[PDB]
Amino acid sequence: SDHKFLTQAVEEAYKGVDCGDGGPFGAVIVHNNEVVASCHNMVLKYTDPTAHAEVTAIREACKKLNKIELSECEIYASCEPCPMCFGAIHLSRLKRLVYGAKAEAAIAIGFDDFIADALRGTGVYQKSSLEIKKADGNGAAIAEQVFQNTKEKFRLY
Amino acid sequence: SDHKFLTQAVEEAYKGVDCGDGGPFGAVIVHNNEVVASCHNMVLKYTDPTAHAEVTAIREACKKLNKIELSECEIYASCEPCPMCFGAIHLSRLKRLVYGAKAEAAIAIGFDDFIADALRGTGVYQKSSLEIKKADGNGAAIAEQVFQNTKEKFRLY
Ligand SMILES: C[n+]1cn([C@@H]2O[C@H](CO)[C@@H](O)[C@H]2O)c2nc(N)[nH]c(=O)c21
Ligand SMILES: C[n+]1cn([C@@H]2O[C@H](CO)[C@@H](O)[C@H]2O)c2nc(N)[nH]c(=O)c21
Ligand SMILES: [Zn+2]
Ligand SMILES: [Zn+2]
């Protein structure tokens, strides 16, 4: 099921790039095995630099469930969440994060070197408690491939 | 000019907590002495845990100016921005941050112990070169007192 929902987050990344909504990033939020939100980056569509895939998914999930905490939910991110997104995941109280590509994969095609210490376990003032899984094998291959496949199919930001 | 806009952010904090929109946090975004957005925390009003004051102000300012970078703007935060908000400030390309109260003043009334390494210069992966000013003297004292003053008017969320 991890592979199914991570692959859906990657699909979201491709769709968002395809329609010009934003960059190649997707996020899926699930309650057990029911998708509560499925989103991609909306920075260009919304004229909103906070509208990353993960933030968008968190907003949509909180609306869908009518509350500001998602402690029964897990999030799948096609790419390692940035410091803004990882902070949002902390505030939302999501209980588990599974992510596909390491941040360096996005850096390699032109995005900011902008990495969350709290996710990598090097934070001093910010310490995470949630369970974090970096995908391997086929999930990692798919997630990494996103950046080579979508290179110069969108406008960087 | 710094004292005027910091005071505006503090007044936003009181206004938001008084009408129930969210916690006692305010933020004002300015473009060469013209206010672009003046906002407070809307987590409760919006059912959105990402709707901190700073994030809300960035959303509003970017939509107003029809662009996703605010590189000619500065942001005044009644309180030291959290990891999520500092990440949003970084992504938005705001050129300067002035903040009133240290994060410990909010933590002292029960908010999350949740502090941005990149703001305090304590990260391995996340750096900032953003121009950052912690206010001092008069407006700093006032900003610090926001939390003791509003402790009773809202319930931690
Ligand atoms: C819109 N966007 C930009 N980056 C950028 O990817 C790099 C590595 O994380 C960082 O530069 C971050 O800002 C995003 N990252 C994720 N995980 N999701 C997004 O929507 C996103
Ligand atoms: C809704 N909210 C919660 N915190 C809390 O602030 C602490 C760190 O400063 C953290 O405990 C965080 O949860 C907020 N902080 C600011 N600056 N602005 C907000 O709108 C906000
Ligand atoms: Zn992000
Ligand atoms: Zn914040």
Coordinates of C-alpha atoms in Angstrom, one line a residue, chain A residues 47-99:
Chain A
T47 CA 0.2 32.6 -7.3
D48 CA 1.2 31.3 -3.9
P49 CA 4.7 30.3 -3.0
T50 CA 3.3 28.4 0.0
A51 CA 1.2 26.2 -2.2
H52 CA 3.6 23.2 -2.3
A53 CA 2.1 19.8 -2.8
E54 CA 2.3 18.8 0.9
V55 CA 0.9 22.1 2.2
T56 CA -1.9 21.9 -0.4
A57 CA -2.7 18.3 0.6
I58 CA -2.7 19.3 4.3
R59 CA -5.2 22.1 3.7
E60 CA -7.5 19.9 1.6
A61 CA -7.4 17.0 4.1
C62 CA -8.1 19.4 7.1
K63 CA -11.1 20.8 5.1
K64 CA -12.3 17.3 4.2
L65 CA -12.2 16.0 7.8
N66 CA -13.3 19.4 9.3
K67 CA -10.5 19.7 11.8
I68 CA -6.9 21.1 12.0
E69 CA -5.1 18.0 13.2
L70 CA -4.6 14.8 11.1
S71 CA -3.2 12.5 13.8
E72 CA -5.0 9.5 12.3
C73 CA -3.5 10.1 8.8
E74 CA -0.3 9.5 6.9
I75 CA 1.3 11.6 4.1
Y76 CA 3.0 10.4 1.0
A77 CA 5.3 12.9 -0.7
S78 CA 6.9 12.3 -4.1
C79 CA 9.9 14.3 -3.0
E80 CA 11.5 14.8 0.5
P81 CA 9.5 17.7 2.1
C82 CA 11.2 21.1 2.3
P83 CA 11.5 23.0 5.7
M84 CA 8.2 24.8 5.1
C85 CA 6.4 21.6 4.3
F86 CA 8.0 19.6 7.0
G87 CA 7.0 22.3 9.5
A88 CA 3.4 22.1 8.2
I89 CA 3.5 18.3 8.6
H90 CA 4.6 18.7 12.2
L91 CA 1.8 21.2 13.0
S92 CA -0.8 19.0 11.3
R93 CA 0.2 16.2 13.6
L94 CA 0.3 13.6 10.7
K95 CA 1.5 10.4 12.2
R96 CA 3.7 9.1 9.4
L97 CA 5.6 10.5 6.4
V98 CA 6.7 8.3 3.4
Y99 CA 8.7 10.1 0.8

